[PDB]
Design a protein around this ligand. Structure first.
Ligand code: WDF
Ligand code: WDF
Ligand code: CL
Ligand code: CL
Ligand code: NA
Ligand code: NA
Ligand code: NA
Lengths: 305, 305
């Protein structure tokens, strides 16, 4: 029993973190086989960062401009290129700790683990969701650029996120490992604003199901509403609309607890309209929206309490 | 910026998790050099577990009763013994991935990372505090026994916790790596109750400081109270008393934000008396007490916003 924000074990990713230095700029890189991936703005000085032309800046560099360190051992660069906003450095040694891996791009509302790194050295691990406005609410200080987010599926690491920058609101933006930004952001030091965020409804429902699985029941009721009637209260409280395909993935949770999805939606409606009246759910005093249906299944028991 | 529940990277501990099987019982073990550590109740059958004499049960076993698996590779046991509630299995191979490590026992209120494991295979990582009643609010299903909790200090792993069991309230109990239980618990299948828990005051203050460091300020005020006057409101709301030594470790946080400890205590007093009036702090709608002063410093910027 119990429910925690739970990250994937980070060892397979720790074996891949290196430090990339170009001039006076230093950040983290991801070393898979004989390629290091890092944010391309490692090639920018302080002035370049304001309005950079990256094709120009890269053409003025050669392999010797790039210092790659895996611990103390230095990797010599034998090639470089640009793929959108990530830099690729070909090195002369294939990372022998390279796990099975894929580059995947995730959807708003999905979660992943973040290995925060500084100077090529892992310092912490945590769980994150991709917000509906394509930012993440991470924990990153200067020098964390190049930290990656990932999911693990049977010793295969699916890399979904590379960290590039913090926005004015303190939230974080980056790319997939092909260098394509999540959301309407660009890698230059200008003030950029995310769109307005919304609450991930299917995740809140999944987390209510985790509550029931763990014995928290006070918020339930006998009422039921219809799909379209709920979606009206959603829009009022700035929640995502619920789809019949979202209901379907919530299916296994519905079956295991015996509580139909639309039944649980009525309880959510009531929680939105009346608040919690001082009580808590799974140790929280607000509705949590960063656990997916998959996250609930994998952490919770297979049998309801 | 940002503030997250953050675990230590788990790789150094992942290299040490093995599966121990004795008869039909299977749980996780910790392999350091040529010794495997696991909970001693791996030697109990279902009936033995009700009222076990472990000295009897162990004397009736030999090295061949114990199956140790590190992945597929099997380790052959060349000796066994008991140290309080942990079993020690001498194996014929020193773990080549053995990190620098120590066995340390932590205090109520301190935090550590937990590597949850099933059948010798790491499945998740999270942060935990030792509660003042010597339980932890973990996330553990059947087969997680033998999972360890740890802190990392410059590539030295300080192991502080081995998981043994879940109590009736759903909280979790275990030992240090010498096999001495945290709290008044014993390793047998009888209903055991923790004492009443209390809120870790110094941690809540540390987390309020993290709020200020990150720009959350609405809860502050100009008031100040005295140490002894605060401790009276503490006892009313079931909070730990504040010591002058707790103030001192909060010193660095006090200095960096410019907010004296007793100043912050007044804001806490007001938060206790009036609640949050609907607002949140660091993304939470209750007062969080599982971040230590050290956890705040290590994750937060060195300069206030
Ligand atoms: C309301 N309050 C409570 C919220 C408080 C939050 C305050 N938030 C900041 O002060 C971050 C600040 C915001 C900003 C952005 C652009 C701009 F014009 C002016 C300001 N952001 C940077 O200064 C970028 C500029 C930048 C550099 C390179 C590129 Cl490609 C893009 C950009 Cl935007 N630096 C990094 O992100 C490097 C990494 C970094 C540095 C410092 C701190 C955190 C991190 C991280 N991770
Ligand atoms: C109020 N609600 C919302 C809270 C709901 C929480 C319900 N909580 C339980 O049902 C756990 C249950 C409680 C219990 C304990 C003793 C007893 F008499 C009767 C019941 N505990 C076990 O059954 C122990 C018995 C036991 C076995 C061996 C030893 Cl040495 C000591 C003890 Cl106490 N088994 C494990 O802990 C093996 C590991 C395990 C199994 C199953 C689930 C989780 C875990 C974990 N981790
Ligand atoms: Cl290349
Ligand atoms: Cl031994
Ligand atoms: Na975590
Ligand atoms: Na209902
Ligand atoms: Na004050």
């Amino acid at each position: 029993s119990g429910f925690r924000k739970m990250a994937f074990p980070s060892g397979k990713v720790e074996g891949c973190m290196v430090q990339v230095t170009c001039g006076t700029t230093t950040l983290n890189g991801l070393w898979l086989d004989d390629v290091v991936y890092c944010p391309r703005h490692v090639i920018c000085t302080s002035e370049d960062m304001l309005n950079p032309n990256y094709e120009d800046l890269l053409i003025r560099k050669s392999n010797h401009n790039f210092l790659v360190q895996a611990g103390n051992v230095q990797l010599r660069v034998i090639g470089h290129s640009m793929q959108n906003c990530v830099l690729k450095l070909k090195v002369d040694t294939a990372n022998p700790k390279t796990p099975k891996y894929k580059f995947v791009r995730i959807q708003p509302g999905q979660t992943f683990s973040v290995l925060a790194c500084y100077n090529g050295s892992p310092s912490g691990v945590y769980q994150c969701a991709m917000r509906p406005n394509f930012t993440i609410k991470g924990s990153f200080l200067n020098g964390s650029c190049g930290s990656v987010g990932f999911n693990i599926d049977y010793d295969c690491v699916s890399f979904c996120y590379m960290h590039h920058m913090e926005l004015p609101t303190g939230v974080h933006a980056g790319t997939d490992l092909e260098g394509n930004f999540y959301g309407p952001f660009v890698d230059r030091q200008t003030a950029q604003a995310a769109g307005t965020d919304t609450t991930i409804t299917v995740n809140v429902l999944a987390w209510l199901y985790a509550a029931v699985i763990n014995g928290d029941r006070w918020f339930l009721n006998r009422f039921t509403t219809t799909l379209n009637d709920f979606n009206l209260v959603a829009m009022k409280y700035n929640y995502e609309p619920l789809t019949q395909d979202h209901v379907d993935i919530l299916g296994p949770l519905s079956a295991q607890t015996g509580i139909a999805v639309l039944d649980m939606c009525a309880s959510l409606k009531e929680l939105l309209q009346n608040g919690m009246n001082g009580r808590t759910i799974l140790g929280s005093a607000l509705l949590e929206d960063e656990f997916t249906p998959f996250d609930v299944v994998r952490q919770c028991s297979g049998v309801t309490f």
